[PDB]
Specification:
Chains A, B: It is an enzyme of class 2 (transferase). 2 copies of one chain form a homodimer. Chain A is α+β, with helices and mostly antiparallel strands and 599 residues long. Chain A folds into 4 domains: 76 residues, 2-Layer Sandwich (Phosphorylase Kinase, domain 1), CATH 3.30.200.20; 187 residues, Transferase(Phosphotransferase), domain 1, CATH 1.10.510.10; 80 residues, Ubiquitin-like (UB roll) (Roll); 237 residues, Substrate Binding Domain Of Dnak, Chain:A, Domain 2. Helix content of chain A is 51%, strand content 13%. In chain A, the strands form 4 sheets. A 6-stranded antiparallel beta sheet of chain A has the order 1-2-3-4-6-5, with helices on one face. The first copy, chain A, has a 5-stranded mixed beta sheet with strand order 14-13-17-15-16, with helices on both faces. In chain A, strand 3 and strand 4 form a beta hairpin. The longest helix of chain A has 73 residues. At the A-B interface, helix 10, helix 13 and helix 14 of A face helix 10, helix 13 and helix 14 of B. The structure holds the ligand CC(C)c1ccc2oc3nc(N)c(C(=O)O)cc3c(=O)c2c1 (2 copies). One ligand ANW binds next to strand 6 and strand 7 of chain B.
Chain lengths: 599, 599
């Protein structure tokens, strides 16, 4: 092992220079050791001064003992880098929405700080971007090491040029895949990649070659497999397209403003009950409900006037100018439900039907490890989708229960109003005949039409109540019989299989670094290869045969049940508007009974 | 390494016979290898036949190659045993309620199966009780190895005798500590332990010697540090006391019935909003709401008639004979709230004030590892308490919001009723004078008292509405200003520190097994010892100075706010009952206006 006056480090604990994990001799504290005249000591001094949350801290520069080479003692990051993170199987299709926002925040704050100090980081990339655990348990990302797949079109032939690798990095972080992918690999087909980058039509954000020498699939949208909400997708997509000829690139100042406008927005969770879709609304703290409805329309196509809100079992009435920071707090588990009195197509969750790749029987430490990553990533995606499908079903079941409770309030508000006017109708109908005992035939004939008109409402209200009752045709019971429930524990069953798959993946990663295995370790490696396929086949069978099939039956049943719900609200409204119309005609003949008197 | 025809195993992977972790030569599958004429082959054959969920499966018995000794190839349990689990720091004060119920279920099913087959397991204990992960992610516990601290009073001098070690095991699992503890250790003071076990007065479930040669603390209750709900505590406590002179022991058949009666009960989560206490109600599927109210009274002292229920923002009206299996589904996050119209003392969460033990500077691999377990266990407890305190605050804030919404419904129901009778009062007051123009002075004077009596209600209703409005004295705003919130992330801050503490604990466990460390590894061990105390002191400071202090301010503010709430419901009721009384006196003079007529 080498050493310096203050530090020492084993060469085995290595993290083209080398980086080792070592300790301070006097404290034992972990530090990053960078192992490789005054032109460097100057730029080192300015870097030694840099103290920022998003910059890995450089503590000291010491001389190793055996060589006189300059070493840097740097802040150690136990978790590793964004590359490490993006190599994990649960992020194979993008970071979790919450995690993606932390990467954006910390990268943005570090860059601006760099610009503010004149440094240029020619090649930002996931391998340059280190992760540390903040004292509050949230990831904090920190830039370090300033001074192909990420290189600019001008650089690939061999500032905005920095924005390019930033763009690729964010797409990779958002989707788990590179945005520009020749068939095979970009390094493998360096020539195809340059054509893709220069010939890209403006606005496009990706180009994938699916067959060898095949065409390029352009897209202005994120892939379906991206986990970011549509709300977030709608804001991020234009930024990437407009920052990936640097003449028409956005530029930093515009980039900093547009990204700050995203980071300053809060998220409101909305579930479209008739469409069976969950939504995240990215809205500024100071925006009004008026603005909120427009953002919801963009994702739902429900005009403001048709948006009917339900929250914690009761109607939510938003005032147009009420600011979003004063809205009730929501989560994915507790969203604001939106419903509409106008028919809407039931969409549900739209996801990609992805099958397992074939498992190549040929023993290959590199291929199996490469395959293990891909097949494990698919199961992670399947597990995430299973959870969202279950959540969609759980939210559906809760929202319907509340809506039934809302209708009963409406039913009780109008039903009281009727009996409330009956007490006057049945009273004033006789008080007329009271005077008679002390043309009136024309008043009684018109009045007897109101009681007869009021009887058709009574029997119709009793028919709606009958339908809202436990045996009614709009009953709830079906929601507990179809689809899947938490007590079914389908998600835990998939995660258990994933954990078995994840252990083998990490072992294949270890098996790769050691170039050859002994006979025994070799056999064990081949045994677990068949178990991988066996676990994946069992899981996919359970996922497709049980989760998806039952989800579509619950969804198909909802679509007809939804249709019924719309019919009831329409019938109730008609009965409700007639009660106001009847109420005012009786409140009009109430006085024309009494004439002026002589006195 | 040794081997047999079908299996082989390294001696390093060892799990007084030895148990190693090995593989099947042809498949690679993990199995437990037990390494030590026809008297044994017979009992082995009956054991080879045993196929049960709660019995570790014995697959085959083979002969090792170097020795002719008989070995048993047994089902491998990757997680280890209940001892292992109970050694983890987050279970230092008992298993999670959900986990405790799984241990009970699997132990009970295996025992009965054993009895049903005639086997006797003379010494059940956490080390005998192995854990495996079920295919649904839930622990499954399985008995194995049949054929001091757990020994019966008759056995300690040197079937029911089996129930004793079962009793000690359940207490240990429930609380994290042994029920019978001489000062120092039971093994250390074998003599004190026997007096404790024979001289224990009936009904007592624990005996702890807190000082050397000191007295015995008896208890019929679980310690405060137990995590099991009071609902569960109320059922478990009598079982342990009555199964720990075997003349008056419960016996198996009674034990199996009483335990089945517990396992067959469902759990309903209840939060007493006026007491600020959460509750789990252990109730049978077929019990009625009538029975439910009695169980709630036992934990709350709220008589049935005074129990007012709120669920998902609306009143919950339970019919007395409605079975519990038809109740709405509840969780700790979404409980049924109970409120009362009668004043109740605000209790809140009652927990033990536990300080850190002192850290002994004396280097000792055994002492530090022993200390590391204890001090890490305390922080786990503090983290669990922090979470419950936060949950209590979050549930309080939600329930109050709903109650305010409930009162507004009540306020609107009576306020409509009034205006509904005004339309008749203001109508019939003039219709009287209508006839006059065509003793009556006595009718007008009594009637003008009703409008005057109705004006005092109107101004009083406007005063309650004023108080229910945003500026009202019963405002909600305070609930968002006091205590702690999820966005404060206090729990994550504690878990992060715990994870740092937990890594050192596991390292101390490793450092212990290796009897001596080299100079370098020794220094690193001493460095992390000071960090342990440093992390614990920082955490406790944050816990006491921030979490507890702010919790008591939110609680103290609630107690006065609660007092106000009770005053409003009492004033509203008075205004509400007068509206019915007024309504019927006006509905009585409405007809006495018109007399019989000649005809
Ligand atoms: C084995 C791989 C996943 C890994 C694990 C932990 C690591 O911890 C680091 N800390 C640092 N400060 C720096 C740096 O400042 O460059 C780099 C690394 C790693 O490369 C690194 C790499
Ligand atoms: C290192 C310690 C925590 C540990 C970890 C895994 C283990 O996995 C086992 N599986 C079994 N079938 C049996 C058995 O059948 O006796 C016993 C053990 C262990 O003792 C055991 C002990």
């Amino acid at each position: 092992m080498q050493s310096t006056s203050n530090h020492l480090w084993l060469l085995s604990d290595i993290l083209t220079a080398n980086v080792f994990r070592g300790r301070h001799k006097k404290t034992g504290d972990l530090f990053a050791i960078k192992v490789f005249v005054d032109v460097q000591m100057r730029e080192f001094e300015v870097l030694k001064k840099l103290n920022h949350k998003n910059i890995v801290k450089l503590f000291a520069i010491e001389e190793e003992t055996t060589t006189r080479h300059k070493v840097l003692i740097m802040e150690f990051c136990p978790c590793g880098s964004l590359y490490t993170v993006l190599e994990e199987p649960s992020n194979a299709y993008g970071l979790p929405e919450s995690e993606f926002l932390i990467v954006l925040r910390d990268v943005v704050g570090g860059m601006n700080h760099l610009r503010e100090n004149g440094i240029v980081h020619r090649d930002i990339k996931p391998g340059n971007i280190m992760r540390v655990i903040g004292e509050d348990g949230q990831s904090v990302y920190k830039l370090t090491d300033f001074g192909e797949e990420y290189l600019h079109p001008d650089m690939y032939e061999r500032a905005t040029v920095d924005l390019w690798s930033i763009g690729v990095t964010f797409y990779h972080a958002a989707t788990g895949s590179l945005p520009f992918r020749p068939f095979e690999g970009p390094r493998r087909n360096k020539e195809v990649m340059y054509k893709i980058i220069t010939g890209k039509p403006s606005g496009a954000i990706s180009g994938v070659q699916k067959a060898e020498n095949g065409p390029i699939d352009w897209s202005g949208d994120m892939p379906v497999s991206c986990s970011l909400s549509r709300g977030l997708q709608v804001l991020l997509t234009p930024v990437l397209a407009n920052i990936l000829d640097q003449e028409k690139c956005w530029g930093f100042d515009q980039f900093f403003a547009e990204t700050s406008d995203i980071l300053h927005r809060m998220v409101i969770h909305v579930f479209s009950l008739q469409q069976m879709t969950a939504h995240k609304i990215y809205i500024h703290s100071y925006n009004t409900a008026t603005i909120f409805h427009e953002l919801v329309y963009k994702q739902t196509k429900i005009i403001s006037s048709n948006q009917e809100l339900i929250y914690e079992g009761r109607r939510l009435v938003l005032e147009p100018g009420r600011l979003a920071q004063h809205f009730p707090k929501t989560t994915e588990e507790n969203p604001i439900f939106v419903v509409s009195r106008e028919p809407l197509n039931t969409i549900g969750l739209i996801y990609e039907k992805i099958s397992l790749p074939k498992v190549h029987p040929r023993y290959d430490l590199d291929g199996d490890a490469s395959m293990a990553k891909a097949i494990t990533g698919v199961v992670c995606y399947a597990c995430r989708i299973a959870s969202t499908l279950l959540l969609y079903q759980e939210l559906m079941r809760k929202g319907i229960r509340w809506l039934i409770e809302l209708i009963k309030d409406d039913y009780n508000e109008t039903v009281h109003k009727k009996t409330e006017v009956v007490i006057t109708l049945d009273f004033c109908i006789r008080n007329i005949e009271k005077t008679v005992k002390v043309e009136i035939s024309d008043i009684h004939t018109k009045l007897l039409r109101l009681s007869s008109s009021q009887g058709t409402i009574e029997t119709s209200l009793q028919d709606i109540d009958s339908r809202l009752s436990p045996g009614g045709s709009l009953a709830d019971a079906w929601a507990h019989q179809e689809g899947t429930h938490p007590k079914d524990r389908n998600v835990e069953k998939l995660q258990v299989l994933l954990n078995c798959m994840t252990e083998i993946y990490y072992q294949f990663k270890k098996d790769k670094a050691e170039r050859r295995l002994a006979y025994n370790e070799e056999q064990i490696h081949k045994f677990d290869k068949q178990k991988l396929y066996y676990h994946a086949t069992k899981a996919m069978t359970h996922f497709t045969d049980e989760c998806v099939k039952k989800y579509e039956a619950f969804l198909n049943k909802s679509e007809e049940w939804i249709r019924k719900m719309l019919h009831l609200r329409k019938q109730l409204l008609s009965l409700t508007n007639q009660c106001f119309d009847i109420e005012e005609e009786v409140s009009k003949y109430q006085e024309y009974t009494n004439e002026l008197q002589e006195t």
